[PDB]
Amino acid sequence: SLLPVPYTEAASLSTGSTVTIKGRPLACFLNQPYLQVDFHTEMKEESDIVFHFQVCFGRRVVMNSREYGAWKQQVESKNMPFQDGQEFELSISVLPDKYQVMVNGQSSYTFDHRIKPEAVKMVQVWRDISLTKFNVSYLKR
Amino acid sequence: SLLPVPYTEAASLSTGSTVTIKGRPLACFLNQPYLQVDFHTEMKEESDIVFHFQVCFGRRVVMNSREYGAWKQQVESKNMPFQDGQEFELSISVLPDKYQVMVNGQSSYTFDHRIKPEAVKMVQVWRDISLTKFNVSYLKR
Structure with a gap:
């Protein structure tokens, strides 16, 4: 649709940052489309x-x-709040101890920090989605 | 690049048909991009x-x-003729007993017919590739 996928944006993260992602899968669930969000330490995609x-x-x-x-x-989850054929709103919040992933307003996954979020320099959103909004919040000190 | 991905084309296949696909992965191999080619029995993607x-x-x-x-x-193969960061030329030939998949001119995979190729009505090429050429041959009776 609007934002080009694969989507890459230089970024910085710290406690209180939020990454908002609104998009839609490019295929019905039966065909198993993927969505991938990677917080990278450098702009280089192999970083x-x-x-x-x-x-x-x-x-x-x-x-x-x-x-x-x-x-x-690897951490693996069967929790699947995403709905077949539907637009989704994805919200990744940087908390002091972990990332918290909200899907359509509902807490769905967390991932404890293994590397300080200050190491992030780039975010990439890709695989089988169209993208309508991408935002990194920059309001906190 | 040129042809929109996901790429869908109505199609018919029989013994002697060839499907030619030229494209490039959208990410380095370290990031594990996917490519998927599906020969569908109907235009509907869930077919x-x-x-x-x-x-x-x-x-x-x-x-x-x-x-x-x-x-x-499921049939699974570790044969990997595709080259990291490179354009690929994919050729799927309909033989009497099986599909034969050539990659960059080299025979790489075969898949015995489970359903007559005459059941195919659509081909879809999608996941993490850009596409420059897609062709279904229509020269044989």
């Missing part, structure tokens, strides 16, 4: 990932980090 | 799939069919 968030719509969600080029301990 | 071909670039290839809404016996 390390502080928070890796991958939805296989209708199936599962995987969360992990990639440190010095290697994937670490 | 059955006669030949499902899914590349996880740099990792594996999965082939299957989806019959009356259910996935059947």
Whole structure:
């Protein structure tokens, strides 16, 4: 639709930052479209990932980090608040101890900080979605 | 790039038909972009799939069919002729007994017919690729 996918934006994060993502899957759940949000330590797409968030719509969600080029301990969830064929509003909040992922206003996943959020320099949103809004909040000291 | 992805084209297949697909992954292999080619029995994207071909670039290839809404016996391959960061030329030939998948001119995968290729009405190419050429050959009786 509006914002080009894969979508990449330079970014900085700290306690109190929020990343808001509004979009829609590009296929019905039967075809298992994916959505991936990666918080990167550099603009380079092969850089390390502080928070890796991958939805296989209708199936599962995987969360992990990639440190010095290697994937670490994968966290896997079957919680699936996303609705087949529907627009979704995704909200990732940086709390002192973890990321909190709200889906359509509902707390759905958390991921404890493995690397300080201040290490993030870029956010990329990609795979099988269209994107209508992307925002990183910059209101706190 | 040029052809919109997800790419859908009404199609008919029989022995001697070839599907040619030229494209490029949207991310380096470290980020595991996907490519999926589905030969559908109807234009509806939730319709059955006669030949499902899914590349996880740099990792594996999965082939299957989806019959009356259910996935059947998955075939899995570690053969990975695709090259990191490179354009690829994909050629799926309809032989009497199977599909033969050429990658950059090199025979790479085959998949025995589970449903007659004459059941195909649509081809969809999607996931993490850009597309520059798509062609279905229509030269044989």
